[PDB]
């Protein structure tokens, strides 16, 4: 479609809305121009969702507990408030780890204060203090506790900070109050920020006066990789083959100690900008540690990233970088040779959270595919700035897309594949459009790095080319 067809597509779709909603949604839909570097000239983002329009967004608790804190494997994370939020989010996100669950690691468990009426009426701080003692008795190898506030906590005026300080002091334990109530902000995004500031304020400074860490020139941390299906491990392997030492992973397969050791590193490598730029900036400000954005989706981006990272070190690392690249060349070339002919020319529309909607485009392009539409649940304009140069001219961008919009856009655009989430998957399959989950990787992955690209390619091929898609039309209709 031309710029003008996409533009009239947007206008037609918005005709359904009452005027207030129509005027708002118009601001969140744009036709890409890769000439633009200021996205605040063409799309609005990180605003409230319009009531009743079936946003795909979640809340600040999802962005704090579900996203940032939950993966930290040797801490216990309390879903503090009523029973729902911890139950729906129990083991929904595939933030992989190595541990002995229920013993030294706790990620897929749901710890909750299960608020009842009396807790709402009289407050839950006494319950929280008792709950902490119960945790200590039954889970003695936990290395710290976080308190992930749900909607009621702030609303009823509880003081989880006092409880965390008093109990933390009494038990010589790191207990972290996190004010991530879902009434705060507009989406998962503010949850990330809240979570980052909680790490800063309650964990990150613990070893500030401790000089025992055996530091080297090659120490880095992977910042903002939550190890979905092992994504961080398939990144780490390459960084270490390149001669670097990955002191920490924030927060997929992450331990509290590796977080406390991060201020000792030489360089912070930021994959998820949206979720962990805040703490990255803090670390530069306080500790003088530089940070840099990278991308480990597909061979083209991965090679560029390895090279850009290696360039921050010495000749020995630059040399290893080229050895790594040479090692994996035949492997990814074989993936391309097998799968690109099966996918060349195919058109994809994406809708994801805060990073992937731009970050995966290169990987699609390494298989000859075109991303014809993309958008985010909860990105900010600094994300859109990074997106417009990665997308083609006259492609469709959508911020906090409504269910209606997404369906109507797909009907007109007729993508060969859609990459989005669980709430979207079954809608599009019924429409006869191959769908891949691009949050959970549809229970596959990893997708990061060279080993991830093989699985990514296999997966896009098995679904887009599956025999089922030829069968939706009964032969008598």
């Amino acid at each position: 479609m031309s710029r003008e067809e996409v533009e009239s597509l947007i206008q037609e779709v918005l005709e359904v809305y009452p005027e207030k909603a129509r005027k708002d949604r118009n601001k969140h839909l744009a036709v890409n121009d890769p000439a633009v570097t200021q996205s605040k000239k063409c799309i609005i983002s990180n605003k409230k969702s319009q009531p009743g329009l079936m946003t795909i967004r979640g809340c600040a608790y999802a962005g704090s507990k579900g996203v940032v804190w939950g993966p930290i494997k040797d801490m216990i994370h309390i879903s503090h408030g009523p029973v729902g939020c911890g139950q729906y989010s129990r083991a929904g996100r595939r933030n992989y780890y190595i541990g002995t669950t229920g013993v030294n690691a706790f990620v897929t468990m749901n710890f909750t204060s299960d608020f009842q009426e009396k807790d709402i009426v009289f407050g839950g701080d006494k319950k929280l203090a008792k709950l902490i003692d119960e945790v200590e008795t039954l889970f003695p190898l936990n290395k710290g506790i976080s308190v992930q506030s749900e909607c009621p906590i702030g609303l009823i005026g509880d003081d989880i900070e006092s409880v965390s300080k008093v109990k933390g002091a009494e038990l010589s334990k790191t207990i972290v109050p996190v004010r991530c109530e879902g009434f705060r902000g507009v989406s998962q995004s503010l949850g990330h920020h809240i979570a980052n500031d909680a790490v800063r304020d309650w964990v990150l400074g613990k070893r500030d006066e401790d000089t025992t860490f055996a530091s080297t020139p090659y120490d880095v941390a992977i910042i903002g990789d939550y190890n979905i299906g092992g994504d961080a491990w398939s990144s780490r392997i390459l960084l270490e083959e390149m001669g670097l030492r990955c002191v920490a992973q924030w927060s997929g397969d992450g331990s509290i100690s590796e977080i406390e050791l991060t201020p000792k590193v030489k360089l912070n490598l930021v994959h998820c900008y949206r979720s962990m730029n805040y703490i990255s900036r803090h670390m530069e400000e306080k500790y003088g540690i530089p940070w840099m954005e990278y991308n480990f989706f597909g061979p083209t981006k991965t090679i560029e990233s390895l090279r850009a990272i290696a360039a921050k070190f010495d000749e020995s690392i630059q040399k290893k970088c080229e050895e790594v690249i040479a090692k994996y060349k035949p492997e990814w070339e074989a993936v391309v040779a097998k799968y690109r002919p099966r996918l060349e020319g195919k058109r994809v529309m994406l809708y994801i959270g805060g990073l992937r909607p731009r970050h995966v485009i290169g990987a699609y392009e390494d298989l000859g595919m075109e991303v014809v539409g993309t958008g985010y649940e909860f990105a900010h304009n600094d994300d859109y700035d990074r997106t417009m140069k990665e997308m083609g001219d006259s492609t469709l961008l959508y911020d906090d897309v409504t269910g209606y919009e997404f369906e109507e856009f797909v009907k007109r655009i007729k993508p060969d594949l859609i990459g989005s989430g669980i709430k979207e998957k079954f809608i599009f399959q019924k429409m006869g459009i191959p769908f891949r989950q691009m949050h959970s990787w549809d229970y596959s992955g990893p997708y990061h790095g060279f080993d991830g690209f093989a699985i990514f390619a296999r997966d896009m091929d098995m679904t887009l080319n599956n025999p089922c898609w030829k069968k939706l039309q009964a032969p008598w209709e």
Binding site: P18, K20, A21, S49, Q50, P51, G52, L53, M54, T55, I56, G58, C59, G81, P82, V83, G84, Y88, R90, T101, N104, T108, M109, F111, D114, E117, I120, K127, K130, E134, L138, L141, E150, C151, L155, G182, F183, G185, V186, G230, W233, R236, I237, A248, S255, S257, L261, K338, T402, Y404, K423, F426, Q429, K430, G432, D451, A454, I455, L472, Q473
Partner: protein, 522 residues
């Protein structure tokens, strides 16, 4: 590394030596991990009676609950009405979760809206969110009814749903005649099943409270059926099937089976089937109203009895042989329809299956959990099979329900080693299956982690999970199954006996060691 013609996903990729060595290095360098001997020591302690005693003393901490929150149940209830949009007044994070939770169980779209109240609504309340939300929802998704429930934020700040909806109509945001039934659904009271009761009662009141004076009990010659919170498609279907075979006029009130099972034919259908408005409006003219899951339909029951003047019969959930028989006999009494030859034969086929499989079922010991009516029906059927339901866990059960189940246990010698637990969670259940090991668990997917824990103690201590309940996320299409009626009992029997025989085959598969008992015929 990958070999292109045999690509490895996470399992078994990360077992390659280079990944293993990398992970060992990460652990040793940076994780400051407890020594393996200490991990082993603590694990072993968590399997003990001493640990169980401490675990059962918990007052403040909940671990691995076997319940969810009210509005989840209101949403499922709402989905069962024709062209009805579930609408949860409050915080949007909740709706993302409710939809995803059901998406994963049904492997289907699940449509529901929020009105996206934010922190700002704490000053003033969510009245404007309701006005625009209702207008936007109606225009955009074109439902014929919007069924309104609440999230906990809206409950804590005290928003008056009734007044907000009335004001929405007064100021023209939706038409006066447009149906907007509502219910308050606080997550900090009861559980998801309570949300279902509250929503249903709100819908029943909406369509009937003000129009009672023309109603005459029995004048439509039908029986109303209220299913409660139900996540097996086969359960809505079997009840309709049995009643139709019997020639009994009925109205199934909240019937999501079509919208939870649309065909993949090239279009998306946001709405399908469902109970009609005309069925709700005419419901007081029924002969009576039968509650399939009475232990979570108490508020509904009071409305049906007090306002519709229906003499709701005291019937257990129709699970197992006796309670299916009782349901059919009562429906026969109310309707005047004889039980047909087809159902008599079906019953006898179930009995035949019981006779054929009884030797493998006899004395088998189960731990089990779920919602109260499901759990008690499962207990009853297990007793009918000569099985021992030794650990009966219902996190969201109550004292009156426990007393009822304790009485059912007392009526059978197969209940003598059984204990019923209410308010306890799957971390409590984990202890019980270590300290008083049963043969199997019957439960939802959260059970898999208990099985994992038991195997770690040793193969001889492993307790296999049999997946019956909600949610089931790690197997495909089990939501099509049936647990009610003779069909459901036949399905449960089959699953149970074959789970027993599968485990026995595993235990006897050892060449020259245990395969003397690896029989071809069982």
């Amino acid at each position: 590394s990958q070999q292109v013609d045999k690509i490895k996903a996470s399992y078994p990729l990360f077992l390659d030596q280079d990944y293993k060595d990398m992970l060992a290095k990460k652990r040793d360098g940076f994780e400051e991990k407890y020594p393996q001997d200490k991990i082993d020591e603590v694990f072993q302690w968590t399997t003990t009676k001493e640990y169980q005693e401490l675990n059962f003393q918990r007052e403040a901490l909940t671990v691995n609950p076997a319940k969810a929150c009210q509005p989840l149940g209101a949403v499922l209830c709402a989905l069962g009405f024709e062209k009805t949009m579930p609408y949860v007044h409050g915080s949007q994070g909740c709706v993302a979760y409710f939809r995803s939770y059901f998406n994963r169980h049904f492997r289907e779209p699940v449509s529901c809206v929020s009105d996206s109240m934010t922190e700002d609504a704490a000053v003033f309340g969510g009245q404007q969110n309701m006005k625009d939300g209702l207008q936007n929802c109606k225009a955009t998704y074109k439902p014929d009814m919007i069924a309104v429930s609440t999230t906990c934020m809206a409950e804590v700040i005290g928003d008056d749903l009734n007044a907000f909806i009335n004001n929405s109509k007064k100021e023209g945001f939706i038409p006066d005649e447009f149906p907007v039934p509502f219910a308050h659904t606080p997550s900090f009271v009861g559980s998801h099943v309570t949300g279902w009761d509250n929503m249903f009662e709100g819908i029943a009141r909406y369509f009937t409270l003000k129009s009672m004076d023309d109603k005459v009990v029995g004048s439509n010659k039908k029986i109303n059926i209220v299913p409660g919170f139900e996540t097996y498609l086969g359960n809505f279907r079997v009840i309709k099937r049995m009643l139709s075979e019997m020639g009994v006029g009925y109205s199934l009130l909240s019937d999501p089976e079509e919208v939870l099972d649309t065909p993949a034919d090239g279009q998306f259908r946001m709405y399908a089937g469902g109970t009609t408005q005309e069925e709700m409006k005419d419901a007081p003219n029924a002969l009576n109203t039968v509650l399939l899951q009475p232990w979570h339909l108490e508020k509904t029951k009071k409305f049906v009895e007090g306002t519709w003047k229906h003499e709701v019969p005291k019937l257990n959930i129709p699970m197992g042989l006796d309670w299916t028989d009782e349901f059919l006999m009562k429906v026969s009494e109310i309707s005047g329809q004889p039980i047909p030859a087809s159902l008599t034969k079906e019953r006898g086929r179930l009995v035949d299956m019981m006779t054929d499989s009884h030797t493998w079922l006899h004395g088998k010991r189960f731990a089990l959990w779920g919602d109260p009516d499901f759990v008690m029906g499962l207990v009853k059927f297990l007793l009918e099979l000569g099985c021992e339901p030794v650990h009966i866990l219902c996190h969201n059960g109550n004292k009156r329900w426990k007393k009822a189940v304790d009485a059912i246990l007392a009526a059978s010698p197969y209940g003598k080693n059984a204990t019923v637990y209410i308010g306890k969670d799957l971390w409590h259940l984990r202890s019980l299956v270590f300290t008083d090991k049963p043969d199997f668990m019957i439960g939802n997917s959260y059970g898999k982690f208990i099985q994992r824990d038991t195997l770690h103690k040793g193969k001889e201590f492993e307790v296999p999970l049999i997946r019956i309940g909600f949610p089931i996320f790690d197997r495909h299409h089990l939501h099509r199954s049936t647990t009610l009626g003779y069909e459901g009992a036949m399905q449960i029997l089959t699953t149970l006996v074959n789970s027993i025989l599968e485990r026995l085959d595993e235990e006897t598969r050892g060449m020259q060691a245990t395969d003397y008992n690896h029989d071809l015929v069982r």
